[PDB]
Amino acid sequence: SAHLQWMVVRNCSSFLIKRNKQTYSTEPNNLKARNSFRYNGLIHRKTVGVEPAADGKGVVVVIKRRSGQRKPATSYVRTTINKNARATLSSIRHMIRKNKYRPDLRMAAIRRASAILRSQKPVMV
Amino acid sequence: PSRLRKTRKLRGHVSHGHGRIGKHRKHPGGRGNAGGLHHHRINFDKYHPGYFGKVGMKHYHLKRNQSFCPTVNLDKLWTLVSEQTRVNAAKNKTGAAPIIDVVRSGYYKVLGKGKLPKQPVIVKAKFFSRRAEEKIKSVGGACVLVA
Amino acid sequence: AALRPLVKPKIVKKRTKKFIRHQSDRYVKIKRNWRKPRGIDNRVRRRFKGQILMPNIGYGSNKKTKHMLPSGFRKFLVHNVKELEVLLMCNKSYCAEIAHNVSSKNRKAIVERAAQLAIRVTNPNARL
Amino acid sequence: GVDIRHNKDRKVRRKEPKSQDIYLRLLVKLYRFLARRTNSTFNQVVLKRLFMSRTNRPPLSLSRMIRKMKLPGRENKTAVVVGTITDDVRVQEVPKLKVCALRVTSRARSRILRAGGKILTFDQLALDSPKGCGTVLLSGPRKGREVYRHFGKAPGTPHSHTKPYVRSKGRKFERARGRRASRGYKN
Amino acid sequence: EPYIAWGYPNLKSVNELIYKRGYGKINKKRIALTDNALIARSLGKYGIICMEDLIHEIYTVGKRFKEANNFLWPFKLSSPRGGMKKKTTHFVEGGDAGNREDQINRLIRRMN
RNA sequence: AGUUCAAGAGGGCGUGAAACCGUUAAGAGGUAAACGGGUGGGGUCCGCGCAGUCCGCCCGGAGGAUUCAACCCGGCGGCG
RNA sequence: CCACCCGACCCGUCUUGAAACACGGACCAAGGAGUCUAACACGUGCGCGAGUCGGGGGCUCGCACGAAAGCCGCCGUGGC
RNA sequence: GAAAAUGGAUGGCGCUGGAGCGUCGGGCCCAUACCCGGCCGUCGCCGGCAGUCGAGAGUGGACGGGAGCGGCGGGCCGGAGCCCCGCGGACGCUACGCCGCGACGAGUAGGAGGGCCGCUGCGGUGAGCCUUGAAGCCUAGGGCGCGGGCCCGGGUGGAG
Ligand SMILES: [K+]
Ligand SMILES: [K+]
Ligand SMILES: [K+]
Ligand SMILES: [K+]
Ligand SMILES: [Mg+2]
Ligand SMILES: [Mg+2]
Ligand SMILES: [Mg+2]
Ligand SMILES: [Mg+2]
Ligand SMILES: [Mg+2]
Ligand SMILES: [Mg+2]
Ligand SMILES: [Mg+2]
Ligand SMILES: [Mg+2]
Ligand SMILES: [Mg+2]
Ligand SMILES: [Mg+2]
Ligand SMILES: [Mg+2]
Ligand SMILES: [Mg+2]
Ligand SMILES: [Mg+2]
Ligand SMILES: [Mg+2]
Ligand SMILES: [Mg+2]
Ligand SMILES: [Mg+2]
Ligand SMILES: [Mg+2]
Ligand SMILES: [Mg+2]
Ligand SMILES: [Mg+2]
Ligand SMILES: [Mg+2]
Ligand SMILES: [Mg+2]
Ligand SMILES: [Mg+2]
Ligand SMILES: [Mg+2]
Ligand SMILES: [Mg+2]
Ligand SMILES: [Mg+2]
Ligand SMILES: [Mg+2]
Ligand SMILES: [Mg+2]
Ligand SMILES: [Mg+2]
Ligand SMILES: [Mg+2]
Ligand SMILES: [Mg+2]
Ligand SMILES: [Mg+2]
Ligand SMILES: [Mg+2]
Ligand SMILES: [Mg+2]
Ligand SMILES: [Mg+2]
């Protein structure tokens, strides 16, 4: 289970980074990249992953399926949301809150998409 | 694992836990069991009463095979046979009793600690204790001697 | 302007001078790196007035500002772009430092990527 | 200053298991919460015993738990031991029993189940009896270890039935001066 | 006698000590007496539910003085403003140790 | 002058520490020097500061559009 | 780097007592001292549990790793 | 009364309407002690948080009748939804984590804990770093850490 696997990888993981009195988790589907049971993106049955789209416009929201936990090829569903910021945040907010899919990660996913979109804006010096 | 020893923690402490006054000298007090009847008498008398002296008859060329006599108590006597044998006898219609050969199990003497289940049994042994034979008789069993 | 931290609390240091080893001035063999004096008569160990001060836990810094650079950020050594990505969701409190051994070719890629993600870099102009 | 002594300030008690067992530490997580969020002092004892070392969690034999469960008013209650249940080959009839233990040996497990019993782990016990209601908390014999024979008054003192440390047992081993009046004395 | 200066406090001294510096021993902790609920939850069973009851119980030496007085953490007073006369001798010798009777109130004012 | 990426690798020659010395620059100097704490002065260098809060929402003006809600058709997912 | 005010005796060591007219130490670099084996005790961790343990041997068409690993069960002789 | 060897000691200078001796008053000075407050750590609290539970929710209040009162249906006979103008509402909880409160803090010999202190090599791992410059070394460069130490800039160096 999630609690069992956490006790295995809480301190021994290829994604774990311990440095400068800080701990980071480099695993995918981890919003905040924090080494935390809550934000870990591998041990849970339901995970939310927000990363930039392949091209530098929009975000891709990743949703783990309840079925096929042991089948990594088909376990994740990738959706590309490419529209204005307010509409993009609303779509993610509905994907989390309305589907009751990991509501603990609502603001985490919104802030991550908010930060990714701001990065995709042209940088002015 | 040397990294977990006190030596690593004692680096920079001068006397290494051995004192500034008494120091760590070579053999203060003698080597081995020196002084057992002298300066180390109290230790020897306190933790090893009986250490010094001769007691008893000495026997040359002791062959421990001769005195080999492993023992099994009564309480663990039924473990020597399969559980099938015990239950089949208890529900047996006629008064047929199973034969338990403790010599086959690797025991020579049957001692009498504990109590037996109330069912007849034929116990074969080289030696029987008095209570062991009494308790076998009480449940309706028999003691058979073998060589 | 430079990227700003989420908060900029007043940083209080109980002591700014380093703790020098006893008698490290009188000799070159005695480096300044602190060593606890364990001599039986050592007046520094016995804490006589006007002597070398000995580090103790009472000098510990406020936990709210411990490890915080004077800019208000907290350092995080990075070696590549991928290691820079972990600072995306904490770029208001943690800044990046590029490792001393990263090449000038790779360093330019890290710096510009940190510009896009609004991650402050403490050593941006190095090897340029 | 303050006229106090600080040698007793730190209490030497175990606040976490020394073990790195993840399953045990998950049980401690479960029972830390139960002890905190319930008023059941049964939970506080189980949590405390989950920390304890192996020597402080002696095995409980099948016979002793059967004997302690046959006492009046202990029918249909569940036997809880924070430790191992071992089989006792000196017992013939295993009664139907409901037991909760960290470990149960294979033959003890087989005998309890063939008798119609039900074996629970501590996660299952939390579900059935969250406050430990209807439980018989049992301990194995703590001083059943052979080391306690050597503890106490020194063997060379009067009225001291303490087992000495001897590399061998026999006529030539610590049976002379100080062990009989015919050689010096006897204590 | 050498180590203490004591006397007989009046009503005002009992008031000021418990109001300014009164702390309660609640669950082995030194808690300032900021609310009456702290007193009532500890000394309520004895009929003491407010600072006024506690002052009255202390001042008149009532039937629960021991519980009410043991409830009070020892008063941590300041050094005597204006200085001591002589800590090492008795009050009647011009010093400060011993029983100064009603004059303890003067010392309480300077130390509270 | 030349070779070499390099002699700032020149034949006990990779790197080239400390002790110690020479020179250069700066500072100081009658209680041997050195040291702790506190400030002050100078210098070096850094921020490169040298016009120096941005972020969110709302209001107003001034533009532009792959245009919003709703509804229909596919696909996927969550829950029952 | 320098100035000034207050503080400020040289460390290590043995010692009841060291700044000592007690000893060692001119300076710097590198090397430099509780180890390993057997035994025993207790404490702690893990496995199994009235048992437990193959450590010696053998089997697996030996052999980069692999001199490892796996297995034995009428190999548990034997130790405890 | 009263004499000792270098020149010397109410600590010195000096002090005689006292800066001497005795008895006394007021004020004033400052320790690392005491009080109040900040920060660090230690220790204690059968300490709090799995409720991330923006409808949760949290003394024991409900349900079904019989009988009713208080308000809501006198032209007295009179008993409805939980959600919705808004579809939304920060952080958290590496549970070995986070949070609160209180008291405490000298130390040789010695004991114990922690060390994201440090060195060398091995199994893993970092789709790690590196001839666009590794190790090392130098540095009135910039910083972090109570500290052990560490990071970065510049220089030198040339293969890890
Ligand atoms: K020792
Ligand atoms: K020079
Ligand atoms: K010496
Ligand atoms: K000397
Ligand atoms: Mg010491
Ligand atoms: Mg010595
Ligand atoms: Mg000695
Ligand atoms: Mg510092
Ligand atoms: Mg030095
Ligand atoms: Mg001394
Ligand atoms: Mg200390
Ligand atoms: Mg104190
Ligand atoms: Mg102490
Ligand atoms: Mg005790
Ligand atoms: Mg005053
Ligand atoms: Mg005295
Ligand atoms: Mg070169
Ligand atoms: Mg040339
Ligand atoms: Mg060169
Ligand atoms: Mg060269
Ligand atoms: Mg050379
Ligand atoms: Mg100074
Ligand atoms: Mg002497
Ligand atoms: Mg000395
Ligand atoms: Mg002398
Ligand atoms: Mg000598
Ligand atoms: Mg000499
Ligand atoms: Mg060396
Ligand atoms: Mg053991
Ligand atoms: Mg075996
Ligand atoms: Mg080989
Ligand atoms: Mg083998
Ligand atoms: Mg055997
Ligand atoms: Mg045998
Ligand atoms: Mg003098
Ligand atoms: Mg201390
Ligand atoms: Mg790993
Ligand atoms: Mg910096």
Curated annotation (Swiss-Prot), chain A:
Name assigned to this protein: Large ribosomal subunit protein eL28
Covalent cross-link Glycyl lysine isopeptide (Lys-Gly) (interchain with G-Cter in SUMO2) as placed by the record, residue numbers: K57, K64
One GO term (biological process): translation
Known partners and oligomeric status: Component of the large ribosomal subunit.
Keyword annotations from UniProtKB, A to Z: Acetylation, Cytoplasm, Isopeptide bond, Phosphoprotein, Ribonucleoprotein, Ribosomal protein, Ubl conjugation
Domain of life from the UniProt record: Eukaryota
Organism: Homo sapiens (Human)
Phosphoserine: modified positions: S114
From Swiss-Prot, chain C:
A single GO BP: cytoplasmic translation
Nucleotidyltransferase listed as a keyword: no
PROSITE patterns: RIBOSOMAL_L32E
Primary location class: cytoplasm
Pfam hit, one: Ribosomal_L32e
Localization (cell): Cytoplasm
One GO molecular-function entry: structural constituent of ribosome
Covalent link (Glycyl lysine isopeptide (Lys-Gly) (interchain with G-Cter in SUMO2)) residue numbers: K8
SUPFAM superfamilies in the record: Ribosomal protein L32e
Positions of modified residues (N6-succinyllysine): K49
InterPro entries cross-referenced by the UniProt entry: Ribosomal_eL32, Ribosomal_eL32_CS, Ribosomal_eL32_sf
PTM annotation (Phosphoserine): residues: S61
Function: Component of the large ribosomal subunit. The ribosome is a large ribonucleoprotein complex responsible for the synthesis of proteins in the cell.
Name under which the protein is recorded: Large ribosomal subunit protein eL32
Gene: RPL32
Curated annotation (Swiss-Prot), chain D:
Cross-link Glycyl lysine isopeptide (Lys-Gly) (interchain with G-Cter in SUMO2) placement: K118, K163
Stated consequence of mutating L50S: In DBA18; uncertain significance
Region of interest: Disordered: 150-187
Keyword Ribonucleoprotein: yes
Primary subcellular site in the record, as a coarse category: cytoplasm
Related illness: Diamond-Blackfan anemia 18: A form of Diamond-Blackfan anemia, a congenital non-regenerative hypoplastic anemia that usually presents early in infancy. Diamond-Blackfan anemia is characterized by a moderate to severe macrocytic anemia, erythroblastopenia, and an increased risk of malignancy. 30 to 40% of Diamond-Blackfan anemia patients present with short stature and congenital anomalies, the most frequent being craniofacial (Pierre-Robin syndrome and cleft palate), thumb and urogenital anomalies. DBA18 inheritance is autosomal dominant.
Similarity comment: family membership: Belongs to the eukaryotic ribosomal protein eL18 family.
Name of this chain's protein: Large ribosomal subunit protein eL18
Gene behind the chain: RPL18
Swiss-Prot record, chain E:
Cell compartment(s), UniProt: Cytoplasm
Taxonomy, superkingdom: Eukaryota
Residues found modified as Phosphotyrosine: Y3
Subunit and interaction comment: Component of the large ribosomal subunit. Homodimer. Interacts with DHX33.
Protein family (similarity comment): Belongs to the universal ribosomal protein uL30 family.
Function description: Component of the large ribosomal subunit. The ribosome is a large ribonucleoprotein complex responsible for the synthesis of proteins in the cell. Binds to G-rich structures in 28S rRNA and in mRNAs. Plays a regulatory role in the translation apparatus; inhibits cell-free translation of mRNAs.
Protein name: Large ribosomal subunit protein uL30
Organism: Homo sapiens
Part of the intact protein present: 137 to 248 of 248
